[PDB]
Amino acid sequence: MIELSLAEALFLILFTGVISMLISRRTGISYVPIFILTGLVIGPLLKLIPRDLAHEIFDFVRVFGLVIILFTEGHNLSWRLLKKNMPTIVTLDTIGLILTALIAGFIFKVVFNSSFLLGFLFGAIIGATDPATLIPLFRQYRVKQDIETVIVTESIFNDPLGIVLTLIAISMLVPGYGGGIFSTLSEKLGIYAGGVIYFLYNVSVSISLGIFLGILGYKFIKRTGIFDFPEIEAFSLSLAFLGFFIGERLDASGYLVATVTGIVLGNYKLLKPRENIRILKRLQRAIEKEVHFNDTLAALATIFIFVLLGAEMNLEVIWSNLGKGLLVALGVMILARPLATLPLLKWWNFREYLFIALEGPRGVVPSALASLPLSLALKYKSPLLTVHWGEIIMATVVITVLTSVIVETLWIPILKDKLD
Amino acid sequence: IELSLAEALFLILFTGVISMLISRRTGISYVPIFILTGLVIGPLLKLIPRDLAHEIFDFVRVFGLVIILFTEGHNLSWRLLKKNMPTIVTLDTIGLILTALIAGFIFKVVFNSSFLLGFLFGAIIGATDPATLIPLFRQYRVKQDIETVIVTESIFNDPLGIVLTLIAISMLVPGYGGGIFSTLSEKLGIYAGGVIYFLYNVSVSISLGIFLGILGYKFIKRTGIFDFPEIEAFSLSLAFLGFFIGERLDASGYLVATVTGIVLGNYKLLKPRENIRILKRLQRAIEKEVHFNDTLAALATIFIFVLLGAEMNLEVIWSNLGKGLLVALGVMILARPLATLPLLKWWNFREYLFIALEGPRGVVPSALASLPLSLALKYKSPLLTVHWGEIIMATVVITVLTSVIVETLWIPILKDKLD
Amino acid sequence: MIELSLAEALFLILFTGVISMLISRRTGISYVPIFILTGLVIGPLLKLIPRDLAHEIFDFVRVFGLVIILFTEGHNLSWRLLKKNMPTIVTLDTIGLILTALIAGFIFKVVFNSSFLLGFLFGAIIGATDPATLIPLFRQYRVKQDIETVIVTESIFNDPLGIVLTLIAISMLVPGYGGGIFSTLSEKLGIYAGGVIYFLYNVSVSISLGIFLGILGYKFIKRTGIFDFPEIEAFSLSLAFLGFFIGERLDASGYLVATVTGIVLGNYKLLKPRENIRILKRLQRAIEKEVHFNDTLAALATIFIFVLLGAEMNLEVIWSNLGKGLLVALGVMILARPLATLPLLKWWNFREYLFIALEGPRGVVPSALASLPLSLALKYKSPLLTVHWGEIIMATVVITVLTSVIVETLWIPILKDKLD
Amino acid sequence: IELSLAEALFLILFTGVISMLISRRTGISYVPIFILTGLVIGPLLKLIPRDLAHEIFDFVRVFGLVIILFTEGHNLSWRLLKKNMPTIVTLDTIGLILTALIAGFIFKVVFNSSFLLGFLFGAIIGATDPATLIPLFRQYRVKQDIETVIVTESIFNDPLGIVLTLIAISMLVPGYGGGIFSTLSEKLGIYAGGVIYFLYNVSVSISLGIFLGILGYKFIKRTGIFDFPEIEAFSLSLAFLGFFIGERLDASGYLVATVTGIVLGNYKLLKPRENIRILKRLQRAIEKEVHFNDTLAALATIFIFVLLGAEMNLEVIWSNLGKGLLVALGVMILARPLATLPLLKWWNFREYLFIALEGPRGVVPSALASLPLSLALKYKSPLLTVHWGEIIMATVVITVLTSVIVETLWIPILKDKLD
Ligand SMILES: CCCCCCCCS[C@@H]1O[C@H](CO)[C@@H](O[C@@H]2O[C@H](CO)[C@@H](O)[C@@H](O)[C@H]2O)[C@@H](O)[C@@H]1O
Ligand SMILES: CCCCCCCCS[C@@H]1O[C@H](CO)[C@@H](O[C@@H]2O[C@H](CO)[C@@H](O)[C@@H](O)[C@H]2O)[C@@H](O)[C@@H]1O
């Protein structure tokens, strides 16, 4: 079939998305696994959408959708609230993310023999976190104000970072894919240390440039004074993708850049008392509307990601490695998190921290990166990265997300009473 | 790969923003600014690979159009249609087709091209979109009913302006797509077959259209979905469903989507059935949904215009503007009136001359500008030399530009000097 | 596989061609059906070459190969020898070709219900003749000098003409494919008469223009005086394809044009006694070499055509309609020819003509046009021309060529003694 | 579709003919005339769509090359090779590679491009083909052995000039094709891995080459085929077989074919086995076959050159000729000698300087000119920006032109002033 098949796919996607959201609206079950299972049914079960096409879309979505999503997530948070607990988090992401990634790598490595790189990329994928399916649930069981903040921040920050780790890990697996400066710093200064140097490098660059472009955007809106639709929205998207582009060109993760810009505009209010208020309020409201708009967009993107992930998976590989994946998953949930969150114990009680450690689930970003290695393997051949291992990784990640979301979402309340 | 895409989207959207700025503060209509800026971005700076832009255009040509026409379908009043339904119907069937033919004759006798090619050009330049005229309407206080009938004309010509292109296109491909139209053409000749095919198309499209609209509303009732993002996802879903099925039955999915848009945009009808209580809520929810979609459609519009700007090549358009302008003036001065003269029986002569004269060509042709060239270049069909493609496309560009601008300058003079 | 699969295909083609030619060199059996069967084996039997790829090549070959072949065939004959029997032949081709085409159309029509057009195109395909596999055989059994000439001429002339009929017939089946002037003359003056008017038209145009370009070529070689390789060869090809191009642009069969040019250069010797002989002999020999070269080329092309035809066929359709095809074939052989060659009886005896009528076989051109309708059906969809009918036509043609060549080649000698 | 193709072939071949004419009567070498005429035909007249020409080039790049290199393999003397085999081997391995590297350094420091891109450029401009020099050789009476070693250098550099390109190309594609070279690069680094890969390639290619050659001759004996067209079909068949299998085992099929060409061209060897009676006949049959194939190869050569002429775009080449010429002079004056200095140990200094200086770049680079651009444009690989492609290609054009012409003008002066 021709591009009308793509449209058909689109309709099926959105429709099923709506349906699933209805299920969640009508049943306390999180919408994520519903999305996934729905994708599975709509895909492999009924062969309505083929995996090849599914992936063909999935790359596009993997880019744009994630950009929008991350940007918006950038918009959502509040800098004061994060500054409140700033020292805690930076370590938390940096150490946790990497440590979780590394240890799970070791974890993955044992279950199926693989060069570390494979494991490390697995963890790098599972790196990110998404308690977006818990945030409502927290309010639903009188969860304290304080921790929700730091967790939210953790997710919003680690989402792009998991990618970086992933892109780093992948770059290690395939020579040409690695950017220039990484290659240089690697050959020159080893891979272990090179990873770190490039880490601090691209992080610093990305965040700084993100700030730059962000405030530049703010000033632009200031002078231009665009309070009316749709130019503000268009400008927003253009800005995000700009940050992403430039960021990626300079061998950095443009995702983090855009995200950062989102944080800026989302939490930047600098003005001279000489300035009128006729414009500040207009820009405020404008920003608000644009934000909500992109919230909708990001929602769409999210739905796409989960469902497509659903129709992406190969049942055979899954079932074949069903159990193993499970062990890996629960293992990750109950070992990777607590062990990588140990060095925060000096800030909260042996009981207190246990919650936030044991609670962290895995969602969007890893769901979107599950097919990436497979994508490459299909696109480019490499002995280090077999297609086989691609399918394996993807399957395991699927299981991981499922298990994580389900178990965490289910066992939240029990924790509360049993800890507070 | 995707990096270049990101760059492109960035500069396009940014471009659009800037263009809306300069249009805002200079008061000039935004469209020509769009086209010219796109011109800058593609060929002038050589920043954008024309062919990639062509790919993106291949993307937008269906989806952007679907969305745009859907939202257009929303912004409609069934009542105001009901008032002048015969005027409209006469204007969008007979008038449109006649316009196509006439334009065809023009193109033929100006380029020595085959009449089929000319007719293709006509079909492409059929649809109109005077969204830029509206502010001038409410500003110079043009009579309401006129504005209404013109608008309602556009909303209907946009999708009908598409099928006719697909017709001529299908006529160029020797196999005729092996579709219904092929058969009809074989059993009754191309003319008759074409007519019957048209009627089939429109009929089924509208029936299935209102069908899906109703099914949609009903679905909302049973499901009771009133919140973002569920409602929007639903809307898009329905749109593309309509389109997909539409084309699946060889009918203009665009027409279908538009019709569904009409349904939703004009559905306070089954309100007295259920308690109005929740119904008001769904009404306003639909309203905000519509607004959102309006924004989307605006975006897609920007895409289309700017991309059209970038895709053209100055060599051809220059070498052929000397004739091109003449073609444009030609259609503006001859095609519309001769096609709208049957409408003289209902309305006044002055009113007639006005509504005929004021006929700007907008988005839809721009979206179909590259289409013949694309099909020619891709399918490598013998009847469609690529040069012909460039010719048509350029001609379309000229036409659009000139039409939009002089129509935009017509009003103040055109009103007072006759009405 | 990538374009190396095409190369593989090439090797297989030529190799098997060589093999088959060895068989014919080592066994009196004509090389044509050997080629075909070889193609069948190498194709459908072993799936070494897929039908899709096979056809993809087959279009290319269908063009260029035929051009070269027809051109060379143009070169081969001698104008004096044809002028000897000129009145006989013109009628013979014109009437026979059309009549054979028409009657076989009726013949095809009865065996399987079809609109005439289908039958007419069948006959149009079977139109051409190729006794190239008999020409040696004639010498092998002391066949008289006279008839071989007229038959040779008949083939060389009817080969392009069968195409025209075919292209005409096809054009009738698919609207857009028909050229401009045919369309006009058809709508204006009916299809029956339109066919004739366009026939005389494009024939006259093609032959005239062919002469023009031909002598133009001769003069060019004269002034330029290119006696050395390879410029003469390149120029030859360029000329042929030129004639073909221009011919096709003016809604005429460029094949016939090129062929005609070939006839010209092959048999044109005009010079002033004032002119030296140092150049005439050089151009003579040059022409000779170029001719032989293109003979080789044409041979290659021929091999391609037959073998690819072999790997093109669908065994299922064949077997399904095996018998029917046979009846059609022998029917054609024993009815179409004699009945369409009746009006030459006023020139030769009731016995004499019977030979040349009953002997005409069908070869190259029809072998190359067997897949054309199918080609279109696959490329373009049309209710009048189903893919089904495409496969059918192709199969029937295959059977026809096989049967024709085999039976004629086998039963030649018996005729001689039993008639002379 | 095919109509345009026919037009193209017509004008190309005709063009070639004319070019050979003007080259014949003006005495000037035919190659630059080829390139310039192609220039006329493609961009100048806009007669030929550059991209279609690119397609055709994609066709010729394998087949034309296979034939050309095969026939080249024929025209060879095993004896004369045996004489200076070490000189040759040293010249085609170490010398060639060194030339590539040096050119790479140049390209890098002149365009700021990555060293890999430069090296790609080097690999492309590696191979040489001085077929235009031969007449000047026999005319100005250059020493025989020199001519021989240079020729035998070319015949071997042509295919080796290809693999190195495929190397750098493979290096650009991140997956490295997942081939042997990938593995070797992973286990031993790109340098070592590349070397070992090279040795593997050459070894297997030659072994299998002579294998197929022998198998070919033997086949002829058993089959006793001495006549057109059987013999020719056979030849081509064998060539493409060699190529196919060659590439199937990730080896340069070009190298294989060339080697088989060497085998056939130099096989009077097993004559004393069988009665020479029929053997003389097969010998001469092989001779005429070779001649035929020579004609073919000439044709393909014309194709390649003219097409190269048509494919380029004057904008880029102009905007970058200022540097381009410098790059060319650069390689001619620096790359060869520094790469041929190890050959100083065998031959005299004057002879060395001569054979080094006189190093024209011919067909093979021209065939690989568009290849990086093609792969970049098609695969859309991130490391290969299309602009880079245009740059490389143009640079190659400049290089070829200048090299050929100044080398062609070198000889008369270059001989007497030092030898
Ligand atoms: C700018 C002019 C003032 C207008 C403010 C715009 C609305 C911002 S307030 C904005 O409202 C949402 C939908 O009503 C609420 O979202 C809530 O989430 C709940 C979680 O199950 C759902 O029941 C929703 O129905 C809603 O009650 C609230 O969490 C959010 O903060
Ligand atoms: C121009 C200088 C003189 C050289 C003349 C070139 C050769 C032209 S003569 C040219 O020779 C062919 C191959 O030997 C012959 O072809 C013959 O056909 C026979 C049919 O089974 C085969 O046995 C062949 O071996 C050969 O004897 C002959 O029919 C043809 O006419």
Author numbering:
A (entry chain B), C (entry chain B): 1 to 420
B (entry chain A), D (entry chain A): 2 to 420
Can you provide the manuscript's text about this entry?
H5 and H12 in the 6-helix bundle are discontinuous. dimer indicates clusters of charged residues on both sides of the membrane. transported by PaNhaP, K+ is not. structure thus serves as an excellent model for the membrane part of NHE1.
Six ion bridges that lock the two protomers together at pH 8 break at pH 4.
